[PDB]
Amino acid sequence: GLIRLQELIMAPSRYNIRLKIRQLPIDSDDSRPLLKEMKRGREFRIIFDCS
Amino acid sequence: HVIRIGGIFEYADGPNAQVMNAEEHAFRFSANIINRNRTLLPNTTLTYDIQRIHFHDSFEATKKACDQLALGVVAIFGPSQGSTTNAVQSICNALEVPHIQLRWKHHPLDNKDTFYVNLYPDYASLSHAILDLVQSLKWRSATVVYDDSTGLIRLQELIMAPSRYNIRLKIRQLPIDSDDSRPLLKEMKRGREFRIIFDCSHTMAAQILKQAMAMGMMTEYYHFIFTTLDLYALDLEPYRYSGVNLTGFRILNVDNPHVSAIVEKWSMERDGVMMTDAALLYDAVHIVSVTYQRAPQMTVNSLQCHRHKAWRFGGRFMNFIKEAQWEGLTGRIVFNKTSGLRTDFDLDIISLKEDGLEKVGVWSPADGLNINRSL
Amino acid sequence: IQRIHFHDSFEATKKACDQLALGVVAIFGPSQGSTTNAVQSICNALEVPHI
Amino acid sequence: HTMAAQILKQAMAMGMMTEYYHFIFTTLDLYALDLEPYRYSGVNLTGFRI
């Protein structure tokens, strides 16, 4: 995904935007620890590309 | 009793190219001086083979490997391109052959393959050593500057590191379109930048030296981070007297007098410092040498590509390989046996004086840095 | 049409040499890019395009 | 001019080619060896012309 969107990673040259970065651990699919981490972030404007 | 390995190198005009690299130089050099080292193998003779191919082709080295197995070679080291080492690893694992590797390539756990190792350092351990560095710098603002698109994957650990250790960050690429990033450097001086990390080629590192020298961006207000070990080609007497805080890395035991003497004899033989890639070559030769020495007698055979002939003790000698314990030029060499791949390795931390460059710290994946009376 | 497994360059390399010995004009490769790098190599080597 | 080139070499070598440094250059043969490496440092600077 990095090489899929590194310009979108390097986007904030043209705009005042900050961002978190979250790889899904592909080891399994129970993201509920990572979901509670997102809950600690409690964020609302997030990009998603996966299967 | 004679044994023979092979080797495949990419060049400009392939077999019709002319100049040997220093890797072929060190290849013949190391192999012939360890044949001279009569500590190695009294009755057994180690010979070798060198193939020249072009850059960026799998099929060239495919034919070369089919030639080497039509001969039947006792060991095989790996090529440069990922597209090569794809098919190399495929036919190696398919035909009970080990694939010795040197560079980083992408490695899927989904591609459950076995018969290979790599001499390349695990980037997660590298990035975590850098994390140890910058938390020792106690920084809360930084900027990512990088040469090629590959280092983003190779540094995505450090990219995630602002999560558990909050730090401001800007992310920009060194443009490969020309030999110039000076207007970006003008942006960086306007970017108010003092905390910048650098991974690139030694050639691009020399471009950095030249430009940041010429930009007026050699300031003592700068404390900058450098990944590759290849400062030894590069002069620093135009640089080390400007007061710029700076940090290089090392994995090699230069501080071994023995290894330094190996470099000393190497220095007469084409600044005049033995390549890290040549050190990797020497270590790969010596680990395969030790794993061959540990084993009893086996069946050196010739097998064919279009058929399905696989050499029976290939798994046995793979068990010899992946479970080896060797103290190399870089020092301790040990694998993640879940992967069979070297992920454990120490990092010498070095930095500069007006005197010159000097070792300032160590690193490990386990731990890391270590520097009667009356009232 | 050749049914192959995942994640093997040499498998589709053999089958690519098979469809070359056949002689094919539209080249409909695998999912694994690391597999089909050699396919593109032999396509560009033997004067034939690649899809 | 030779020792002036020595000045440029040493303040180059010491990294004292700074924008916080403002230069009073006097003799007429300033141009002699190349000044363009010293150009893009970004200093304040002054010369003379006759």
Author numbering:
A (entry chain A): 153 to 203
B (entry chain B): 3 to 272, 285 to 385, 402 to 405
C (entry chain A): 52 to 102
D (entry chain D): 204 to 253
Copy text verbatim from the article accompanying this structure deposition.
Ionotropic glutamate receptors (iGluRs) mediate the majority of fast excitatory neurotransmission at the chemical synapses in the central nervous system (CNS). AMPA, KA, and NMDA receptors form tetrameric cation conductive channels that are activated by presynaptically released glutamate resulting in an influx of sodium and calcium ions leading to membrane depolarization. KA receptors are abundantly expressed in hippocampus and cerebellum; display characteristic slow kinetics, are mainly involved in long-term memory formation and motor control.
To understand the structural basis of the receptor rearrangements during its gating cycle, we elucidated the GluK3EM structure in the desensitized and resting/closed state using single particle cryo-EM. Further, the resolution of our EM maps is adequate to show unambiguously that in both desensitized and closed state the ion channel adopts a closed pore configuration, where the M3 helices are arranged in a crossed bundle assembly with the pre-M1 helices wrapped around the channel. In the desensitized state, the LBD-TM linker strain due to bound agonist is relaxed via rearrangements of LBD from a dimer of dimer scheme to a pseudo-4 fold symmetric arrangement, where the LBD dimers are disrupted. Consistent with a 4-fold symmetric arrangement of LBDs in the desensitized state, LBD-helix E separation in both distal A/C and proximal B/D subunit pairs is equal at ~21 Å. In GluK3 desensitized EM map, we observed residual density at the ATD-LBD dimer interface, which was not satisfied by the fitting of the ATD and LBD co-ordinates. Interestingly, the residual densities are in close proximity to potential N-linked glycosylation sites. In particular, the density near Asn 247 in ATD and Asn 402 in LBD appear more prominent in distal subunits as compared to proximal subunits. Hence, the presence of this residual density at positions corresponding to N-glycan likely indicates protein-glycan interactions.
